[PDB]
Amino acid sequence: MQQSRPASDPQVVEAARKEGRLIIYSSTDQSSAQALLDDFRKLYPFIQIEYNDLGTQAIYDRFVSETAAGASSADLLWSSAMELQVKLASEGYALPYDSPEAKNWPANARLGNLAYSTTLEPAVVVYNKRFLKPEEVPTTREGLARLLQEPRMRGRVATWDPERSAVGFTILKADYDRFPAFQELARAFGKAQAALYSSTGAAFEKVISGEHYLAYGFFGSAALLRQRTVKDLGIAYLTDGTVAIQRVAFINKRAAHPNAAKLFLDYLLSLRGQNLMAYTALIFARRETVVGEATPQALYKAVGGKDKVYAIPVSTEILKNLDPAERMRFLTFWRQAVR
Numbered sequence: 337m338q339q340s341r342p343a344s345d346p347q348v349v350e351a352a353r354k355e356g357r358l359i360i361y362s363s364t365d366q367s368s369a370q371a372l373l374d375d376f377r378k379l380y381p382f383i384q385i386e387y388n389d390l391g392t393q394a395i396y397d398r399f400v401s402e403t404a405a406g407a408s409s410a411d412l413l414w415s416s417a418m419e420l421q422v423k424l425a426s427e428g429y430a431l432p433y434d435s436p437e438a439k440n441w442p443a444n445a446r447l448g449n450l451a452y453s454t455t456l457e458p459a460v461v462v463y464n465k466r467f468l469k470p471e472e473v474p475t476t477r478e479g480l481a482r483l484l485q486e487p488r489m490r491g492r493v494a495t496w497d498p499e500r501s502a503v504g505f506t507i508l509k510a511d512y513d514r515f516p517a518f519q520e521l522a523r524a525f526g527k528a529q530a531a532l533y534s535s536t537g538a539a540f541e542k543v544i545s546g547e548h549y550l551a552y553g554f555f556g557s558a559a560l561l562r563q564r565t566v567k568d569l570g571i572a573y574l575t576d577g578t579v580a581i582q583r584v585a586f587i588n589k590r591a592a593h594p595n596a597a598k599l600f601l602d603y604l605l606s607l608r609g610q611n612l613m614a615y616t617a618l619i620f621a622r623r624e625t626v627v628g629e630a631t632p633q634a635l636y637k638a639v640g641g642k643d644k645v646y647a648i649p650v651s652t653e654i655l656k657n658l659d660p661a662e663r664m665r666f667l668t669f670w671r672q673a674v675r
């Protein structure tokens with residue numbers, strides 16, 4: 337295993353030795369993170385890890401309370417709620433730390449030294465293969481809008497409820513902002529009487545039963561994980577352009593064991609951690625050198641080139657999504673199109 341240790345500062349490792357501890361608040365399901373925890377501990381067996389697996393709004397609320405109340409909170413925050421992470425990291429909550437594992441991160445995958453992408457997870461199409469074969473599932477917004485004119489598809493579509501899901505909002509908003517054809521598709525959800533879900537599970541359970549045949553906008557990581565045990569679940573990658581979310585990690589400014597947090601963050605971003613995350617958890621890796629299905633190379637091949645993937649950036653530019661006029665405009669269009 338030794339040749340693939342993450343790059344480390346000896347001073348850090350010796351600090352992290354003295355602390356012994358590492359408080360994670362994370363939106364990654366433990367049973368998906370476990371393999372990374374276990375393998376992180378094998379590299380630094382002198383760090384006792386508190387994985388708190390929490391809802392995204394729970395992490396944001398909890399932290400903001402503990403930090404205001406002046407109490408010991410997390411050492412490290414890891415969340416798919418990109419706008420809430422970037423908000424915390426651009427309001428004084430983050431420890432500035434230049435990760436030696438992030439030297440080749442694109443600028444839009446890090447908030448300078450304040451926060452880092454750990455994943456590159458595409459919004460995909462999923463479909464029950466018993467009801468829609470691969471060859472008739474469109475890979476474009478314009479083709480999907482056409483399929484959803486069919487009376488056989490009425491009531492047979494799931495997508496996000498952007499009014500009940502923060503991640504659903506982020507991904508449909510990014511779609512709306514980047515692809516004019518999303519407006520034709522949103523109208524076609526109205527035509528097909530799309531059902532809107534606040535969770536991936538709720539959606540996927542209705543695709544697997546066949547109560548739906550097709551779900552739009554859910555992430556490739558959850559699909560691949562569910563497909564490991566449901567061979568009737570198909571995945572189609574959009575070839576007219578794909579939006580990708582990035583789980584954001586940052587170190588608490590006021591972390592009590594900051595040096596641990598550095599040794600965990602560097603491990604998450606390393607090829608060892610990214611490899612194990614892609615291979616075990618089926619979470620789509622950020623690092624471009626990972627080999628396997630849940631990886632940038634595989635995504636880029638599936639969509640017809642890297643220039644077809646729009647990564648939602650680890651950038652304060654995404655805080656436009658929190659602007660009440662900018663939400664108003666998108667949600668006005670959405671509710672009219674889908675109802």
Ligand SMILES: OCCC(CO)CO
Pocket residue numbers: 607611625626627628
């Ligand atoms: O490109 C680095 C090789 C690793 C990454 O997953 C697999 O053999």
Ligand SMILES: C[As](C)(=O)[O-]
Pocket residue numbers: 503534535536537558
């Ligand atoms: C945040 As989810 C994977 O339950 O839609």
Ligand code: NA
Pocket residue numbers: 442443444445446447448
């Ligand atoms: Na940057």
Ligand code: NA
Pocket residue numbers: 535536537538
């Ligand atoms: Na879910």
